[PDB]
Design an enzyme around this catalytic site. Structure first.
Site, mmCIF file in Angstrom:
data_model
loop_
_atom_site.group_PDB
_atom_site.id
_atom_site.type_symbol
_atom_site.label_atom_id
_atom_site.label_comp_id
_atom_site.label_asym_id
_atom_site.label_seq_id
_atom_site.Cartn_x
_atom_site.Cartn_y
_atom_site.Cartn_z
ATOM 1 N N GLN A 158 28.381 55.964 34.268
ATOM 2 C CA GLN A 158 29.538 56.647 33.742
ATOM 3 C C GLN A 158 30.572 56.922 34.810
ATOM 4 O O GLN A 158 31.731 57.024 34.485
ATOM 5 C CB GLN A 158 29.132 57.946 33.059
ATOM 6 C CG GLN A 158 28.011 57.809 32.034
ATOM 7 C CD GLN A 158 27.861 59.066 31.174
ATOM 8 O OE1 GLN A 158 26.835 59.768 31.204
ATOM 9 N NE2 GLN A 158 28.887 59.343 30.385
ATOM 10 N N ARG B 101 23.281 67.029 40.147
ATOM 11 C CA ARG B 101 22.466 66.053 39.450
ATOM 12 C C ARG B 101 23.237 64.762 39.263
ATOM 13 O O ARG B 101 24.400 64.770 38.862
ATOM 14 C CB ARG B 101 22.059 66.577 38.098
ATOM 15 C CG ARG B 101 21.512 65.514 37.187
ATOM 16 C CD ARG B 101 20.984 66.135 35.926
ATOM 17 N NE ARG B 101 20.286 65.115 35.157
ATOM 18 C CZ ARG B 101 20.613 64.699 33.937
ATOM 19 N NH1 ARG B 101 21.618 65.227 33.256
ATOM 20 N NH2 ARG B 101 19.877 63.743 33.387
ATOM 21 N N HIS C 175 18.931 56.852 33.595
ATOM 22 C CA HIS C 175 20.035 57.337 32.710
ATOM 23 C C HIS C 175 20.753 56.155 31.973
ATOM 24 O O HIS C 175 21.959 55.912 32.099
ATOM 25 C CB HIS C 175 21.008 58.213 33.515
ATOM 26 C CG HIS C 175 21.823 59.161 32.681
ATOM 27 N ND1 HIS C 175 22.038 60.475 33.047
ATOM 28 C CD2 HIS C 175 22.499 58.979 31.522
ATOM 29 C CE1 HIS C 175 22.787 61.064 32.136
ATOM 30 N NE2 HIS C 175 23.085 60.178 31.206
ATOM 31 N N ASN D 234 16.646 60.512 31.143
ATOM 32 C CA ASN D 234 17.662 61.307 30.427
ATOM 33 C C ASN D 234 17.677 61.066 28.891
ATOM 34 O O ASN D 234 17.997 59.973 28.433
ATOM 35 C CB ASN D 234 19.044 61.022 30.992
ATOM 36 C CG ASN D 234 20.103 61.894 30.385
ATOM 37 O OD1 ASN D 234 20.292 63.033 30.794
ATOM 38 N ND2 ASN D 234 20.796 61.367 29.387
ATOM 39 N N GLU D 235 17.346 62.084 28.104
ATOM 40 C CA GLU D 235 17.581 62.020 26.670
ATOM 41 C C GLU D 235 17.008 60.766 26.032
ATOM 42 O O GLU D 235 17.738 59.925 25.545
ATOM 43 C CB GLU D 235 19.072 62.085 26.375
ATOM 44 C CG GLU D 235 19.688 63.368 26.865
ATOM 45 C CD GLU D 235 21.174 63.421 26.629
ATOM 46 O OE1 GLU D 235 21.721 62.425 26.194
ATOM 47 O OE2 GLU D 235 21.812 64.450 26.911
ATOM 48 N N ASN E 143 19.050 69.386 28.042
ATOM 49 C CA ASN E 143 20.461 69.121 27.781
ATOM 50 C C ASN E 143 20.863 69.751 26.450
ATOM 51 O O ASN E 143 20.156 69.617 25.450
ATOM 52 C CB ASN E 143 20.721 67.616 27.731
ATOM 53 C CG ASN E 143 20.567 66.943 29.085
ATOM 54 O OD1 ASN E 143 20.318 67.592 30.101
ATOM 55 N ND2 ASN E 143 20.739 65.626 29.107
ATOM 56 N N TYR F 224 24.347 71.027 23.756
ATOM 57 C CA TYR F 224 25.776 71.023 23.474
ATOM 58 C C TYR F 224 26.286 71.872 22.276
ATOM 59 O O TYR F 224 27.335 72.494 22.375
ATOM 60 C CB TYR F 224 26.202 69.583 23.320
ATOM 61 C CG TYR F 224 26.162 68.847 24.633
ATOM 62 C CD1 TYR F 224 27.248 68.895 25.492
ATOM 63 C CD2 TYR F 224 25.037 68.119 25.027
ATOM 64 C CE1 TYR F 224 27.226 68.241 26.694
ATOM 65 C CE2 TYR F 224 25.014 67.464 26.236
ATOM 66 C CZ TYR F 224 26.116 67.543 27.055
ATOM 67 O OH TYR F 224 26.131 66.926 28.261
ATOM 68 N N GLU G 241 22.191 69.522 31.515
ATOM 69 C CA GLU G 241 23.487 69.194 30.959
ATOM 70 C C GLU G 241 23.940 70.252 29.964
ATOM 71 O O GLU G 241 23.194 70.633 29.068
ATOM 72 C CB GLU G 241 23.464 67.830 30.247
ATOM 73 C CG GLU G 241 23.642 66.580 31.119
ATOM 74 C CD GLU G 241 23.659 65.293 30.300
ATOM 75 O OE1 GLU G 241 24.154 65.315 29.154
ATOM 76 O OE2 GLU G 241 23.168 64.257 30.787
ATOM 77 N N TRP H 225 28.031 69.536 32.616
ATOM 78 C CA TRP H 225 28.451 68.192 32.316
ATOM 79 C C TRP H 225 29.953 68.221 32.051
ATOM 80 O O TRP H 225 30.390 68.904 31.173
ATOM 81 C CB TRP H 225 27.705 67.589 31.105
ATOM 82 C CG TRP H 225 28.058 66.161 30.947
ATOM 83 C CD1 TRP H 225 29.015 65.654 30.149
ATOM 84 C CD2 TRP H 225 27.511 65.059 31.667
ATOM 85 N NE1 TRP H 225 29.101 64.296 30.309
ATOM 86 C CE2 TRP H 225 28.181 63.910 31.242
ATOM 87 C CE3 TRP H 225 26.506 64.930 32.623
ATOM 88 C CZ2 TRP H 225 27.886 62.659 31.740
ATOM 89 C CZ3 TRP H 225 26.219 63.690 33.126
ATOM 90 C CH2 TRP H 225 26.891 62.570 32.676
ATOM 91 N N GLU I 185 32.441 57.804 28.625
ATOM 92 C CA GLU I 185 31.580 58.453 27.625
ATOM 93 C C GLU I 185 31.024 57.432 26.625
ATOM 94 O O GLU I 185 31.208 57.526 25.406
ATOM 95 C CB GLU I 185 32.320 59.614 26.940
ATOM 96 C CG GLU I 185 31.490 60.505 25.987
ATOM 97 C CD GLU I 185 30.133 60.994 26.511
ATOM 98 O OE1 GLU I 185 29.971 61.254 27.745
ATOM 99 O OE2 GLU I 185 29.214 61.137 25.648
ATOM 100 N N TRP I 186 30.340 56.440 27.184
ATOM 101 C CA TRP I 186 29.541 55.488 26.421
ATOM 102 C C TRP I 186 30.334 54.837 25.294
ATOM 103 O O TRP I 186 31.410 54.302 25.531
ATOM 104 C CB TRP I 186 28.265 56.168 25.940
ATOM 105 C CG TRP I 186 27.522 56.883 27.041
ATOM 106 C CD1 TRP I 186 27.379 58.232 27.196
ATOM 107 C CD2 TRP I 186 26.820 56.279 28.139
ATOM 108 N NE1 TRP I 186 26.608 58.504 28.303
ATOM 109 C CE2 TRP I 186 26.266 57.324 28.908
ATOM 110 C CE3 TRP I 186 26.594 54.951 28.535
ATOM 111 C CZ2 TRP I 186 25.493 57.088 30.055
ATOM 112 C CZ3 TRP I 186 25.827 54.713 29.681
ATOM 113 C CH2 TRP I 186 25.287 55.779 30.427
#
Length: 477
Positions: free
Chosen positions: A18, A75, A121, A166-167, A307, A309, A378, A428, A435-436
């Site tokens: 990213q 991180r 990641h 990650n996730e 993580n 949000y 995150e 984050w 952003e993907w």
């Protein structure tokens, strides 16, 4: 009641694909994300991680920034394909790539910053996907992941905080159910020549748990005794509220949603099994651990990497859910029976602020899993229309200042008032970045990056706000 212990780690998080750029420099091989961005229509804005924040050539600057914002922790992720461009255990190693990250960790340490290193990641070396379908081959992927892990542990003994994955929820559901994220698999043949949305995500879920666990055993056996430090997985997951607070079944589904999204991974890791609710709905499409596997996976977190949000109102569905279902036979919503809202919109359709939910889920996770040590790896936000705004407006990001204020304070109550053992918080992200599937349009940074002017850095107001925020909460002794 809000007060964090004296050793409390805070700072910022990023991910390699990213921010790094230099997609082809210094021997880096392609990752599944380099391939995915090449396919038209997959990235909202036709962009790719090429260049991004050029962070691979700007370690000096990014480190000076962290120090300037007062972070004590940082991180970031290792691009596997800079270490082994083809990824596998018999492929050549790229010593330039190892050396880059070893030096970066030294520079970080020299600057007084604690590194938290994510091994995977999402940037799986493409060759492994092409060879055996990556996560889909259990023994092949576990061997290659474990090989990679050990190279890193041997090379960066100064790191004391390791994250395996990650996730994995994202890698599994978004990679293999909807095809929204690389490698783009799904049953929908208008989107991908390959995939089975009903079966693949659960296989991916499963094998990542295995690979994770191998990597941890390897850490604990051959590296911890001499180098110390810790290792765990990073799970994402949003909070839940009942869509009708009077309905026992919505209230049940608030628990079930969390079980499908998080406990999918966490129950195997603390209890050596999947949640009963998942077994029931999914049956034989949910793999089964062998006894050897149960003993491998169970107990495989030194800490709980988290993580988080947003939250959603959860509204139970009746009947038998479709084969393609991963939520757990329920809907997520931003509005409840009586028209109450989670919060205002951001730039991300899936993201709405709800600090209270952060606290609720910290509690939920702590109760279920025996108050493990938690690092929040995150938390942060996008801000609607931020990509279209004039610089001076962007830097006055009061909405983001407020997100961090409320979420960090809600966390601090979780600790001081509810006894959850949170020992670190990483925002984050340090930088606006790729952003993907949504590309560069969505900005999560506390620092504006001017992609059109040689990726120039401008700390937003949010970036400077964190130090005094944490000065108000971290105890001195």
């Amino acid at each position: 009641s809000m007060s964090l212990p004296p050793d409390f780690k805070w700072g910022f998080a990023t991910a390699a694909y990213q921010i790094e750029g230099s997609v082809n420099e210094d021997g880096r091989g392609p990752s599944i994300w380099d391939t995915f961005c090449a396919i038209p229509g997959k990235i909202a804005d036709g962009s790719s991680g090429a260049v991004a924040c050029d962070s691979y050539k700007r370690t000096k600057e990014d480190i000076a920034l962290l120090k300037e914002l007062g972070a004590n922790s940082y991180r970031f992720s290792i691009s596997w394909s800079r270490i082994i461009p083809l990824g596998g255990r018999n492929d050549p190693i790229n010593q330039k790539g190892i050396d880059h990250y070893v030096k970066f960790v030294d520079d970080l340490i020299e600057a007084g910053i604690t590194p938290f290193i994510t091994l995977f990641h999402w940037d799986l070396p493409d060759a492994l996907d092409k060879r055996y379908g990556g996560f889909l081959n259990k023994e092949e992927f576990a061997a290659d992941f474990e090989n990679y892990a050990r190279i890193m542990f041997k090379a960066i003994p100064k790191c004391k905080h390791w994250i395996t994955f990650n996730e994995p929820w994202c890698s599994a559901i978004l990679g293999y159910n909807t095809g929204y994220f690389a490698p783009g698999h799904t049953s929908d043949r208008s989107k991908s020549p390959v995939g089975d949305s009903a079966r693949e995500p659960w296989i991916v879920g499963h094998n990542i748990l295995i690979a994770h666990a191998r990597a941890v055993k390897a850490y604990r056996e051959d590296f911890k005794p001499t180098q110390g430090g810790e290792i765990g997985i990073t799970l994402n997951g949003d909070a839940t509220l009942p869509w009708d607070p009077e309905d026992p079944a919505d209230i049940e589904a608030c628990d079930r949603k969390i079980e499908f999204a998080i406990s999918w991974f966490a129950d195997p890791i603390y209890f050596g099994k999947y949640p009963d609710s998942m077994r029931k709905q999914l049956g034989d499409r949910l793999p089964e651990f062998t006894p050897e596997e149960v003993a491998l996976v169970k107990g495989s977190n030194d800490f709980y990497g988290m993580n988080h949000y947003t939250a959603n109102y959860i509204k139970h569905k009746t009947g038998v859910p479709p084969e393609d279902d991963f939520l757990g036979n329920l809907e997520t919503l931003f509005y409840n029976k009586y028209g109450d809202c989670i919060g205002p919109e951001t730039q991300s359709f899936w993201l709405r602020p709800h600090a209270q939910g952060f606290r609720d889920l910290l509690n939920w996770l702590s109760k279920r899993y025996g108050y493990p040590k938690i690092y929040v790896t995150e938390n942060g936000t996008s801000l609607k229309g931020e990509n279209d705004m004039p610089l001076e407006q962007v830097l006055e990001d009061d909405f983001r200042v407020k997100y961090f204020n409320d979420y960090v304070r809600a966390m601090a109550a979780a600790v001081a008032e509810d006894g959850c053992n949170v020992r670190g918080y990483l925002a984050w992200s340090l930088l606006d970045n790729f952003e993907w599937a949504e590309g560069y349009e969505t900005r999560f940074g506390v620092t504006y990056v001017d992609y059109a002017n040689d990726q120039k850095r401008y700390p937003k107001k949010s970036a400077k706000s964190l130090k005094p925020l944490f000065d108000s909460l971290i105890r001195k002794e």
